[model samples]
Target: PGMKINTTGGQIHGITQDGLDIFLGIPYAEPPVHDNRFKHSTLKTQWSEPIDATEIQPIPPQPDNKLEDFFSSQSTTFTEHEDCLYLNIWKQHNDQTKKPVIIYFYGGSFENGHGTAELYQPAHLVQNNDIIVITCNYRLGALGYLDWSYFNKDFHSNNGLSDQINVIKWVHQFIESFGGDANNITLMGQSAGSMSILTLLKIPDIEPYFHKVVLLSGALRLDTLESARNKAQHFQKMMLDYLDTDDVTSLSTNDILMLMAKLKQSRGPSKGLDLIYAPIKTDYIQNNYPTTKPIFACYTKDEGDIYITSEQKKLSPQRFIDIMELNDIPLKYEDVQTAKQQSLAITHCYFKQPMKQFLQQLNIQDSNAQLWLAEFAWHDTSSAHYRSAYHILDMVFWFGNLQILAAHQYPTTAHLKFLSRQMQNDLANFAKSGKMPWPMYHNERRYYRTYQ
Candidate 1:
């Protein structure tokens, strides 16, 4: 009787830090380890007894290749765990209003970023919004997305998607009991997480589970596809070679993952584009999404601006050409760079050949190609160093996570509060009614709202 903290999961004990309810390592799924590997998403096996879920848990060995500047400065640590597959839920206010649960899916090009981190601490959201916050840890890097094509079983393809789906389902089955509105769930994410939201929309299998989605800088484009596929296909090949078994029947799960960790370092941080370990959409799974245009999508003005922060040294046309050559990006001709700089010309060309082919094959829509190209405007790399407003910056205003919003952006306390209030209300309205408080995105009304 002296010490027994009870929870919906079990007798769990957590310490409150900085006036926030902290929870760490709550399992939303069974470990996809050993025999459970490569199977359709499985439920967490019933525990023999209650378990402690208040401490931190390790996640897959997602390589952290931060570009030795801004990326790393924003980050505190980088390490991965194979036995890591846990989600954290942080609820600040002890309100019983059945508030909406907002899932913050962080994006590191799908390589690194975790459910537990100081940057994303959700105490302010809980205390301020009187809402429930859920952060999840899923397979990232090689462990989460490597495509193993040879397997004929309904096992390997889209495992990362499956993993995230399972987490959503986990939220579905668990969150309401924790004082969250099971009905008003909003799927929110940045960068790859935004893309993951788009991926979820297309899947249709998990549509009913989430009421709304906020996609920040996550779109399906040539660059997005390039970033995802460069390492995905390679990971699959390396897995087969590592196991020394061509047949799926013979290779065990352990043999395959050993190879994934080996290949994690194959591409470094500058190439954060290589973080995708999931299927690159060779058109195996065709699904339906919003048939109408502008299904709640947004991107940054400076899409590639973040990468330019570390790119102080200007490259001559020759050096730029040499870098592409060195990277083995398949030089079609010497004029590729010149074409890229002008009006999304060769980008359309670069994507049309492979990415467009894949999307078309999947019925992702011919309009998808055109709309995505138009929607995602490239940020200028000319002289002025701009981060293109960033993928996550918009969310601070969009979701009103202002308690945690950048103080530097909104200097005055009153301004931060005012902006934060607007953002939270906007997200709530969007989730409750599928209407952006600003102008809804449309062909005629292709605009987004913000508080200046």
Candidate 2:
């Protein structure tokens, strides 16, 4: 029941099925391609006529076959261009009355992703929940991030974060036309997207745009520091090396595409700190407004495992003990090895210290800073099935898609479907009126209503 909503690049359409309306690849702003790259988003002037949203966006930053994440296509479609800033919408019905909105951010650690991909389709969510759904695509990798070697560049530090803020503002301004209530909007994400959610929330002056937030498998500060930015810089350097261009300023879009295709065909980054933390701290934008708002952050059992194992050796405590470990203090020296081991142990514990600090911000009332840090043993579904119920596994259950997925193929019980439906209704109620079916997180108990 829709047509293309024309913006840059072309037209996008929408669907009205199963008592809801679904829109995909609608532009919330002008594509951040060409000269617009690295700048805060510049929204399109207007969409002369309201149109339909029918297709998933082309994948952002072109998912490279040679690099890519663990659970994606070997030959995935990665749309490479500056005109790639787009957002999709899903509504309960065509009724332009007030309704809550949930903005979705997909996880790919801010690289090689898009809202249009089949795995992230909002069909199930639209079918299950009675609110408007939005799936967003922002810049990723060197194109979206790639920090400045020149530190004092204006607004250059946190560009991606700023871009996201702009997208939110744009959505709030325009979602009403699509039957969504801008005043009752929730920003949500999974994994890396979740990380973005927290960063966006913490930025200064950006509060109040979103009524509530849901972060799955994310934290703050450490995930956005100078060390992290340096790692991302490493990728930008490598990308520059591959493309044979020392000056990113002189490079053209064609230069980026040629290099992207070349890298996609060969061994690209994502191996051993090549692009360590794709969404860096000050790697992209300057500060906007911050969110002193309440947040609901969900953590996975082994959230810190991947981080610890990868970087411990470099900061090995023993190395610190032996100032000249590589020379004066020989590796074979009995005292040197012992000192290194002891030093590494201490530093490793210290490295883990920051995670505790970040967790404190999640439960504002606890003030303990070490508040509510525990794990559960339930929840298993597809693509994330088999693995523990992690990151956004909660999203499916929150919307009743887990049961539908089970019935459709994976064989989950109908009871789960009922629970899913109930949860969706509860979420809807919360969206409409800041109150959930269950008790909200407060000072009483630093608790989590978890599914094992």
Candidate 3:
């Protein structure tokens, strides 16, 4: 509890645990509460007095779920708060070496997740990979991306995106003090978090902050122009009706969050908040390929295994085809004779096909930019679904937190952990140098390596 360091915010005292210098709950932006709600974030002021950066900060208010079993570890519960704009950093003690820095943004479809250690504890990654790891919390739900500008231009939209940009800028400004190379930052995220990074890549101004990118199971799935405007206005109308008021400025932060909860409940969970408040098509992002920097985009073998099988209770051939056409995907199969065939067809429809189209149509103009893909398919004896390599499972491997997978009691857990070491090094190597373990991806060949 006695490790002291000087940061842009103030002289803060953190703790040294297991030979790792851990700094938790350090604010990169001022508390976004009350009147500042739905507004862009501003940098916090420096403090003359010492600030305690010891305990985990309260996370952004979100709905609780099965993340205990989801994370495969004893789940932690942090008090929810509006002033949750904070970050956690893990660095090696006395490691004055300028190491590569990896900043992770958590994925909860832009509605859940916080930058707490209980979910994303990185002691192993920091120590083994010789890198500095940082995680952060951002605004979510209607408060973050509801496009309040539909009512007033000054109301501010994309507060969640603005929060992320602020954090990246903060890292650029102060990461060097923690023995990190500002020029060598790798922006890594999954699902909604990856979508956030994809949106940022469209803005030319954000290019200077990050050197490489690793996107998992999420590519540019931007909201359509009309859909964005429609959802924005629809949500605004829902709020006005719910509050029984016409004035937008009269509503408080808590009032909006309460109203958001009501509207989400009415619409049901299948209709995600992502479409209600998602990244929209902007002029800059229209024709651009993700980034000029080298990128590693990957997905689990059964990307939609859990989503399809669980949502439908089981897959049916016509139901699978209906799902495909419903998502505007061209039908690639006609009939499935058996359940096993139906399962394979579902996988191809949701996960495999979407990624295939993304990589096939990807147009990169940068000559030096390298793109690679990976398929994570290892054996598991826990269950048929577990053996299929479900979605969100690859995250533990990439973060080098495969210990969480041990709880599943897979017979191959030990071998999978051994396999995780190679995957971890591939990411570390990419962060350190702009290269992937596999060669560049070509549309003609569709180059990708397998984990198993």
**RMSD to the hidden true structure, all candidates:** 6.9, 7.6, 3.4
Give the best candidate by TM-score: 3
Residues 1-452 of candidate 3 have per-residue lDDT tens digits of 47987776678778998888988888889888766766889866576688677989988776554444567565556877889999888998875767899999877767777878454666777777788889999988777777677777676777888899888998888888789999899998877887888788777777678988888776556666566566666666766778877566777656767777776665444322124556666665545655467778887887655554443454455555554453455554555545455556545765576666666556335445478888888646556436677567787877677656555554335676678788888888888987886767877688898887
TM-score of 3: 0.87
Stretches > 4 Å off in candidate 1: 1-19, 38-40, 67-75, 149-155, 221-270, 274-276, 280-284, 291-295, 310-388, 395-421, 450-452
Better of 1 and 3 by TM-score: 3
lDDT for model 1 comes to 0.54
TM-score, ranked from best to worst:
3, 2, 1
Sort by lDDT, top down from the best = 3, 2, 1
Residue 263 displacement (Å), model 2: 11
In candidate 2, where is summed lDDT lowest over 10 consecutive residues?
268-277
Candidate 3's C-alpha lDDT? 0.72
Q: Report, for every candidate in turn, its global Cα lDDT versus the true structure.
A: 0.54, 0.54, 0.72
lDDT (Cα, tens digit) per residue for candidate 1, span 15-45: 5555556667866677776666655457563
Off by over 4 Å in 2: 3-13, 48-52, 65-80, 149-157, 222-241, 249-292, 302-376, 379-387, 399-409, 439-444
lDDT of 2 by residue, 222-244 (tens): 23456545544554565667766
Return model 3's CA RMSD, one decimal.
3.4
* Global Cα lDDT for candidate 2: 0.54
